[PDB]
Design an enzyme around this catalytic site. Structure first.
Site, mmCIF file in Angstrom:
data_model
loop_
_atom_site.group_PDB
_atom_site.id
_atom_site.type_symbol
_atom_site.label_atom_id
_atom_site.label_comp_id
_atom_site.label_asym_id
_atom_site.label_seq_id
_atom_site.Cartn_x
_atom_site.Cartn_y
_atom_site.Cartn_z
ATOM 1 N N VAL A 127 0.815 -1.207 0.000
ATOM 2 C CA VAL A 127 0.000 0.000 0.000
ATOM 3 C C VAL A 127 0.851 1.261 0.000
ATOM 4 O O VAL A 127 0.309 2.371 -0.084
ATOM 5 C CB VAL A 127 -0.966 0.000 1.209
ATOM 6 N N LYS A 135 13.368 -0.808 10.527
ATOM 7 C CA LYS A 135 12.597 -1.892 9.918
ATOM 8 C C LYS A 135 12.930 -3.155 10.701
ATOM 9 O O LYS A 135 13.855 -3.897 10.339
ATOM 10 C CB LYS A 135 12.932 -2.050 8.431
HETATM 11 N N1 LIG Z 1 2.849 6.974 -3.918
HETATM 12 C C1 LIG Z 1 3.502 5.727 -4.319
HETATM 13 C C2 LIG Z 1 3.178 4.464 -3.603
HETATM 14 C C3 LIG Z 1 3.843 3.196 -4.025
HETATM 15 N N2 LIG Z 1 4.812 3.198 -5.124
HETATM 16 C C4 LIG Z 1 5.408 1.946 -5.521
HETATM 17 C C5 LIG Z 1 6.568 1.663 -4.904
HETATM 18 C C6 LIG Z 1 6.564 0.171 -4.849
HETATM 19 O O1 LIG Z 1 7.040 -0.300 -6.059
HETATM 20 C C7 LIG Z 1 5.042 -0.224 -4.678
HETATM 21 C C8 LIG Z 1 4.635 -0.527 -3.221
HETATM 22 O O2 LIG Z 1 4.888 0.602 -2.380
HETATM 23 P P1 LIG Z 1 5.626 0.225 -0.946
HETATM 24 O O3 LIG Z 1 6.876 -0.576 -1.230
HETATM 25 O O4 LIG Z 1 5.907 1.469 -0.160
HETATM 26 O O5 LIG Z 1 4.500 -0.733 -0.208
HETATM 27 P P2 LIG Z 1 4.566 -1.389 1.303
HETATM 28 O O6 LIG Z 1 5.732 -0.897 2.132
HETATM 29 O O7 LIG Z 1 4.662 -2.878 1.119
HETATM 30 O O8 LIG Z 1 3.287 -0.942 1.974
HETATM 31 O O9 LIG Z 1 4.365 0.795 -5.115
HETATM 32 C C9 LIG Z 1 5.118 4.462 -5.837
HETATM 33 O O10 LIG Z 1 5.893 4.473 -6.736
HETATM 34 N N3 LIG Z 1 4.454 5.730 -5.414
HETATM 35 MG MG LIG Z 2 7.511 -1.894 2.754
#
Ligand SMILES: Nc1ccn([C@H]2C[C@H](O)[C@@H](COP(=O)(O)OP(=O)(O)O)O2)c(=O)n1
Ligand SMILES: [Mg+2]
Ligand SMILES: Nc1ccn([C@H]2C[C@H](O)[C@@H](COP(=O)(O)OP(=O)(O)O)O2)c(=O)n1
Lengths: 226, 227
Positions: B14, B38
Site C-alpha cells: 500500500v 525496519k
Molecule cells: N505513492 C507511491 C506508492 C507506491 N509506489 C510503488 C513503490 C513500490 O514499487 C510499490 C509498493 O509501495 P511500498 O513498497 O511502499 O508498499 P509497502 O511498504 O509494502 O506498503 O508501489 C510508488 O511508486 N508511489
Molecule cells: Mg515496505
C-alpha cells in the site's frame, strides 16, 4: 426460530457469493431448507446480481433483497450517485427475521467487507448480525496479507459478541503455490477452516457446482448447523 | 525521548515504504532529525530492502534493521522456511529505544499489516507500539475496500489504546476516478488524512521526491510531531 449466519469477507472479490451458494447447495443436499438474503446490491448496470448466482448455482428459491444500485461502488457511494438513500436498519433486520424459521438455514450476504455501510445512518452488517443474533462465517483469501485481514475481521466480530462460525477460503488456486499452502495451515491455527473452494467454481453448471459443494464441506458440520 | 511513529498499513504493497521516505523527507527539510527502522524484513532473496529504499529516496542515513528473511512471505513463514526464529518482543523494542532521542522523529515500518506476527507468540506491531508508547500512522489505498480495511485497522488500534496519528493515502491516482474521490472524502471523515502521495513517486529523483514530500504534508503537522 432457526439458524441465521452472516457471510462476510475480509474484502472485495474474495468469494462471498460463491460461498453462500456453495454452503446453500451443501445444506440443501443435507435436506436443510435454505434462504439467502442480500439486502443491498450494487453494480446492477454491468449486471451484478448475487442472488441470481445463488439461484443458478445452488437452486435456492427463497432469495430476498431490498435495494439495487447501478454503480459498482460501495453501497453509500452508489446511493449518493443515484441520488437516493440506503434502506433503513429496521427494513434489513425485520426482513431477515421474517425469513428466519425453524429448520431453515438463513444466509445473509452483505456488501464488500464487515464494516461497510449497509443501511442509513452508518449501520453495518456487524450491526445487523448483532440485531438478529446471528453468527458470522468469514470468507478469506489464501494469498499474501490474509492473516492480518482475517485477524482484524475476527477482532471486530468478537468486539460486538458476534460468534465466529468458521472460515472459508473463497478461492483455492491451482496449483497452490507456497504462500497459499502456508496460509492455509496458519488460518487453521486461528479458526476452523470449513472449506477451500476450487478456483473458477463460479463458471460451473448447477450439477458440477452441487458435486463440488457437497465434497467441499464436512458432512457433520453442515447437518449440525440446523 | 523524541517522537516514535509506527508506520503500518491496511495491507501489503500500500506504500508504507514510500510514506516513510516521504514523511522522513518532509521532517528532514523542517530541520528535524529522522531515523527509520525496519525490525522485520522479508523477501531479501528478491532484493526487498525497505531501509535501503528509504535511503535511496530520502537520503536518510540513520537506518536500523534487525531480522532479515530471504523468502517473500509473512515473517513467521519466512523464518520457518529459512530455519530461523522470529525476534523476541524485547529485541524489537531495544532496536527502537536505541534510536529514540529528543528532537528526533523515529519511524518504525511494520511488515505487511497491523496484526502480522512480528515476534513470538503472536506479538504484533500494535504490541510494540504499546511498549514504546508510539502512535500509529496508517497507510491506506483509495480503491474499493479501503474504508472497511481502514476502520478494521483503526478499531484494532483503539482496542489497545494505541493513538492513531492519522491516515496517509499511499498511492493517489492522477486523474482520480469516481471511487478514489469518494473514498478520499469518506476517509477524511474517519480520521485526519495527512497526505495522499502521488502515484509513481518511487520514480522521482532526490530533488523531485523531496519537493513532493514538502508539498504532500502540512508543515504545521510535521513540525508539531516533535519539539
Ligand atoms: N505513492 C507511491 C506508492 C507506491 N509506489 C510503488 C513503490 C513500490 O514499487 C510499490 C509498493 O509501495 P511500498 O513498497 O511502499 O508498499 P509497502 O511498504 O509494502 O506498503 O508501489 C510508488 O511508486 N508511489
Ligand atoms: Mg515496505
Ligand atoms: N471458488 C471461487 C471463488 C470466486 N470466483 C469468482 C467469482 C467472481 O468472478 C470472483 C469473485 O467471487 P465473488 O463474486 O463470490 O466475491 P464477493 O461476493 O464479492 O466476495 O471470483 C470463482 O470462480 N470460484
Amino acid at each position: 426460530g432457526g439458524t441465521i449466519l452472516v457471510v462476510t469477507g475480509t474484502g472485495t472479490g474474495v468469494g462471498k457469493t460463491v460461498v453462500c451458494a456453495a454452503l446453500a447447495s451443501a445444506a440443501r443436499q443435507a435436506g436443510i431448507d435454505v434462504a439467502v438474503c442480500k439486502p443491498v446490491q450494487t453494480g446492477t448496470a454491468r449486471g451484478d446480481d448475487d442472488l441470481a448466482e445463488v439461484g443458478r448455482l445452488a437452486g435456492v428459491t427463497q432469495l430476498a433483497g431490498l435495494a439495487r444500485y447501478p454503480q459498482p461502488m460501495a453501497p453509500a457511494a452508489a446511493a449518493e450517485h443515484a441520488g437516493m438513500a440506503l434502506p433503513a436498519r429496521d427494513q434489513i433486520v425485520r426482513l431477515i427475521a421474517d425469513l428466519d424459521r425453524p429448520g431453515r438455514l438463513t444466509l445473509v450476504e452483505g456488501a464488500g467487507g464487515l464494516l461497510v455501510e449497509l443501511a442509513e445512518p452508518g449501520v453495518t452488517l456487524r450491526d445487523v448480525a448483532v440485531d438478529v443474533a446471528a453468527a458470522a462465517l468469514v470468507v478469506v483469501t489464501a494469498d499474501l496479507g490474509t492473516l492480518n485481514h482475517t485477524k482484524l475481521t475476527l477482532e471486530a466480530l468478537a468486539a460486538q459478541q458476534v460468534s465466529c462460525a468458521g472460515l472459508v477460503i473463497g478461492s483455492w488456486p491451482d496449483p497452490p503455490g507456497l504462500v497459499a499452502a502456508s496460509n492455509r495451515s496458519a488460518l487453521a491455527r486461528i479458526a476452523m477452516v470449513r472449506a477451500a473452494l476450487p478456483a473458477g467454481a463460479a463458471s460451473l453448471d448447477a450439477g458440477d457446482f452441487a458435486a463440488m459443494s457437497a465434497a467441499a464441506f464436512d458432512r457433520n458440520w453442515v447437518a449440525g448447523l440446523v
